[PDB]
Write a protein that binds this DNA or RNA. Structure first.
Lengths: 149, 129, 141, 44
RNA sequence: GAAGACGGUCGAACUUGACUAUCUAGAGGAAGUA
RNA sequence: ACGGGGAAUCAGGGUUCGAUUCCGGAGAGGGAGCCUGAGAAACGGCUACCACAUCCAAGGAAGGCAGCAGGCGCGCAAAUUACCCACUCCCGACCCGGGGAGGUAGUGACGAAAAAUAACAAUACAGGACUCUUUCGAGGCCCUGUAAUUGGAAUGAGUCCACUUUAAAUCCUUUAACGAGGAUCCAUUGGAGGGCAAGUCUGGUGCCAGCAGCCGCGGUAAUUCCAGCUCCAAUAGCGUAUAUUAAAGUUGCUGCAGUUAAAAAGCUCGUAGUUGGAUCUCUCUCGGCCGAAGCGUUUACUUUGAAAAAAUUAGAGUGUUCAAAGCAGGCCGCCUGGAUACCGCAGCUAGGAAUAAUGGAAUAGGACCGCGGUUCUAUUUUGUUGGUUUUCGGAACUGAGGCCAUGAUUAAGAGGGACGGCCGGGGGCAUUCGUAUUGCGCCGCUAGAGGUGAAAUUCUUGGACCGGCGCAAGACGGACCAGAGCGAAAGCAUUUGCCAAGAAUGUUUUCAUUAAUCAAGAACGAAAGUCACCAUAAACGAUGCCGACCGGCGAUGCGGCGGCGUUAUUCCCAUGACCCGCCGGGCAGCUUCCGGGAAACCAAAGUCUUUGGGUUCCGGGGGGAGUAUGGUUGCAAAGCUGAAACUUAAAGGAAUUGACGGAAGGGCACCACC
């Protein structure tokens, strides 16, 4: 089941078996990469680009058309964020709780949720520090939390 | 979480053979599981099976001939020297006339009787009878 | 359930040697307080001076008076009540006598009827009680 | 005595006491202060 | 070339403290033990 | 606690012992210091001090048994002040001397091996069976005896010449002579209700004396005490005490347990530890087509090799007269032994390459190539010498170009994170309402109002209580409220707004193992209590967490997907309320020969002797006792941690039959009533 929640749930994507591009799709690899390049300059995260390309372009999987991932394309071109997008959204959520909590100091069930969010940040930061995505002295701290976003 | 994926498959075709069923679906497949099932089939205990290719991991649909009494895993995979094989088959096997212990040796995955014939030790995977 | 992995040998043996102290037989014979409370000090027999003859009263579901002897040991000066087994064997015992005292059978616990008596008399004045009882020897004069 | 040195010390004090007692019992006879040792002799 | 002496070193032991431990002489009492 | 080799026990795994004859260490009363010497911090060498202690003419002098004997002491606990260098070896100037090392006797029921206490025949049996007889009863047919019936045959134990043995002896072995009938040339120790083989035979005793490991026996008929007789077991041995092993799957790795029997932490986070999803089928220079030179990323694993003291253990050979032993022996000068295995772990060597870790090219500082440039250098090169000079060859650094199918495994019915529409008594803040209660203002009414089984207690004509009107105050949110919902757990309910979260669902989004369980460490925590602390409960499903598999059935909550037909928005879609399904998680329920379990019961408390998916805490007969002491936190109450002495043969859990009433329901009788 879930890590910090006490629940379990079977809700996810389910890719098809066939790894080929469909025959209706007329976009090649280079114009799809051009679409990714022009969409990354609006500040869109890698998970938001693939939703746009799926919903309104017929790109079911960018890996099947281009032979590469979204983040690897933006990293090879140089259009990548400094810290990864799933660690970025965890710090943004920890800022917004701490912003709300300093107004409402009696809110116990945002103080508890802050500890679950912040322990998930350290668990995710250790992984990127082993895989050398973050420099090996980067430390999330509550003082420099708000400056990072 | 799921650790020791061979312990899942051997519990599934144990629990289904008790219920009298003809087929078991075990998932995910693995290449250790296929070599274990090949040892059981070549001694007559299961019968043919089909590996289903998902692009993620396999599934295997094993046919069941009702000859299996017990199929078990040994966890962890202890190192078994060739002098230590008799104690393991005293503990695990129900008779000196039938039953097998499956070892992973460096000459492949094989039963305990073949490992003596190749003069080899290894690590134990499990047992069936 | 218990840990089972291939590198669990320190967890397994430090748990067994800590749960071994919850056993009564291990705690008795590996702590040292029970050996310092044993008046024999771990010996099988001992020797003492008979201080007085003592009648001890039997426990409730039967009724008699068991003929014991209060004896102060030689080697450490501890005092002990000890049971004199057969009948007319308290007649063989004077006071201020050398006496040889054994255990009573249950290794420090009181054998059935006699309340709180762990010991029995074997010799008196360096003659065994069985030799006096069956008339093989007499008490020296 | 709950220490290995103090236990040895306690046992040596007890041995000194018991040895003083035994020597005081065996000082009374046949020496520089005691009466003579009287040996009656009988042929059976 | 012996005795001897200044010094140095190794250093058992000795004295006075402090802490700690034991053996013994020790009034008083209490409770339980029966 | 001297350490090993080893010992006992043992299905397998284990547990306990090893002071002790082999090896290694240490120390010669306690410490210290030294001399001599190749070697000593030597003690059967010396010098001090400390503790003991001897001789003395009182001035002085001498000491070290944890060597062999021996003595005292201590104790439950252990031998001769014996003979000899003959054997084994050691030392010396040495074929010659010496050796309490060592050998030999003595004491020696520690312990181990062998092995007497009778054998046979003939009689007799109101024996027994066997052949005949219907049965009686007949047999050299075979066995038995509780026959002090008869009979001579055989022997050692002894006594004892001699030899042999030995250094001299003893012992054993060998032989003379003597040596057995109640063969008195006498077998004992424990038992006789059960466990547990074997007498509710006899007398004595009378809850006494005593027996009894445990259950128990004994109170005037004792199967259990004390004795006789008989019988049982082991037997030259057999009881008792204590340590220890098995029994003990009652310490559990193999291999236990935790709802109710002893037991799972209040909840979530979280470090170490432990455990972790699929996935990838050998060559270069020389020396003689092979070796020397590299290994191949690195290990674990496995198999091999060599190295591992003897003794001990397993085990081969061998008639010590057999055996325990020993290492000898066997033929008629010869012949033959004095094997072999095992010796974990750590470390060496060589093969294997499944399993399990780890590496390598993703700012390309990547490989393989030729080309280029910078710096230094091997020393071969000039008949020799002197000097310059290059080449060659080797490094160390940098520029361009070619080439590689140039280079990122898939996307877990694992996990994070996005996004979408919803959902909820989830939380905080603000705001709004509702009645009730209390108090107050006014009016009318009149003597009661309160509480109980009963009064008791208390306010009222200084008009209580009552009835109506108005105001305020603290609160609190009924019914709707559900074997419904949400929350980590305590817990959460009036309207509206704000703030920040969240589950599930949907997804052909994204990252790509980021995970599970968790010491230490941390956040919140009913209610009582205390000046903010306290952190505790039948904190209860009396039930760790994660994962897989294993039966049905109908409801319900949320989300999604479809489907006749009813309604409402006038039609139409689109939605809402219903109705029929399906899918996914949820809260529950019913059911069952799934299988468990002591059962009650449980779809988990199943997939357990056919025992191994990962991991945490925790139990070990009942009490003493969650007590004392110590440590630690807290102002304190208290919190965490937490014994022992001693006591005891049961305490305890399910289930079944009965017993009871001043529990509730039924049926009945003029020896009940009407």
């Amino acid at each position: 089941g879930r890590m910090h929640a006490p629940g379990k749930g079977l809700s996810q994507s389910a890719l098809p078996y066939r790894r080929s591009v469909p025959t209706w799709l007329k976009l090649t690899s280079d114009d799809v990469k051009e679409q990714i390049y022009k969409l990354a300059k609006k500040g869109l995260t890698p998970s938001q680009i693939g939703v746009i390309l799926r919903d309104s372009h017929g790109v079911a999987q960018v890996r099947f058309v281009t032979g590469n991932k979204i983040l690897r394309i933006l990293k090879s071109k140089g259009l990548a964020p400094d810290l990864p997008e799933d660690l970025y959204h965890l710090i943004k959520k920890a800022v917004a709780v701490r912003k709300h909590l300093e107004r409402n100091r009696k809110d116990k069930d945002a103080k508890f949720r802050l500890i679950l969010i912040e322990s998930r940040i350290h668990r995710l930061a250790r992984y990127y520090k082993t895989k050398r995505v973050l420099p090996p002295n980067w430390k999330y701290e509550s003082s420099t939390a708000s400056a990072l976003v | 979480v799921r650790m020791n994926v061979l312990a899942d498959a051997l519990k599934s075709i144990n629990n289904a053979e008790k219920r009298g069923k003809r087929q078991v679906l075990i998932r995910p497949c693995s290449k250790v599981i296929v070599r274990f099932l090949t040892v059981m089939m070549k001694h007559g205990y299961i019968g043919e099976f089909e590996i289903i290719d998902d692009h993620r991991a396999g599934k295997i649909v094993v046919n069941l001939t009702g000859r299996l009494n017990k199929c078990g895993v040994i966890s962890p995979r202890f190192d078994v020297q060739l002098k230590d094989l008799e104690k393991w088959q005293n503990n695990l096997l129900p008779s000196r006339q039938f039953g097998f212990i499956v070892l992973t040796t460096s000459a492949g995955i094989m039963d305990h009787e073949e490992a003596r014939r190749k003069h080899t030790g290894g690590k134990i995977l499990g047992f069936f009878f | 359930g218990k840990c089972r992995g291939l590198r669990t040998a320190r967890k397994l043996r430090s748990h067994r040697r800590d749960q071994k102290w919850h056993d009564k037989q291990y705690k008795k014979a590996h702590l040292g307080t029970a050996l310092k409370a044993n008046p024999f000090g771990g010996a099988s027999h001992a020797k003492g001076i008979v201080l007085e003859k003592v009648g001890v009263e039997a426990k409730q579901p039967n009724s008699a008076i068991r003929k014991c002897v209060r004896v102060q040991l030689i080697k450490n000066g501890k005092k002990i009540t000890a049971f004199v087994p057969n009948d007319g064997c308290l007649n063989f015992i004077e006071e201020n006598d050398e006496v040889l005292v054994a255990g009573f059978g249950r290794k420090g616990h009181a054998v059935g009827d006699i309340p709180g008596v762990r010991f029995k008399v074997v010799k008196v004045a360096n003659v065994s009680l069985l030799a006096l009882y069956k008339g093989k020897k007499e008490r020296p004069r | 005595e709950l220490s290995r040195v103090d236990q040895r010390h306690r046992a040596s004090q007890l041995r000194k006491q018991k040895k003083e007692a035994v020597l005081a019992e065996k000082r009374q006879l046949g020496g520089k202060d005691g009466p003579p040792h009287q040996v009656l002799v009988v042929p059976l």
